[PDB]
Amino acid sequence: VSMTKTSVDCTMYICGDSTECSNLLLQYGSFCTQLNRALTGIAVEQDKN
Amino acid sequence: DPLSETKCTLKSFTVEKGIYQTSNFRVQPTESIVRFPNITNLCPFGEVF
C-alpha cells in the first residue's frame, strides 16, 4: 500500500557542506528543486494511498 | 519571516492553505579545531636543496 517516504537535501547530497560546490550547482539551475518536488510528490502519495 | 520564505518558494504573493517545504536548515559550526601531531622539528629540506 505504501513505501518509506524519502526526502533528500539534494544540495547536501551533491555538495555536502561546501559553499564552492553549492555555487557551482547553481550553474545547473533548477534541477536541485525539480528532484525535491518529485520526491515530495512520491512522499505525499504514500499518505494518499 | 517564514511566510515571506513561502511566498518566495511558491513565487506568489498569495498562498493557498497548506504545508509548504522551504529552504532547509543545518546547525552551523560553533568553532574550528585543528589537530596535527605535536612534531616540533623542521624537515631536512637543507641537504636536499
CA distance B21 to A39: 12
Query: Could you tell me how many CB contacts below 8 A there are between chain A and chain B?
Result: 7
Cβ distance of A9 and B21 shorter than 8 Å: no
φ and ψ of B7, to 5 deg: -60, -25
Q: What is the resolution of this structure in A?
A: 3.1
B11 DSSP assignment: T
Technique behind this structure? cryo-EM
3-state secondary structure A1-49: CCCCCCCCCHHHHHHCCCHHHHHHHHHHCCHHHHHHHHHHHHHHHHHHC
Q: Does any CB of chain A come closer than 8 Å to the CB of residue B30?
A: no
Q: Which residue of B has its CA nearest to A39?
A: B21
Q: Mark the breaks in chain B: residue after which each occurs, C to N over 2.5 Å.
A: none
Q: What share of chain B is helix, strand, coil (3-state, %, to 5)?
A: 15, 0, 85
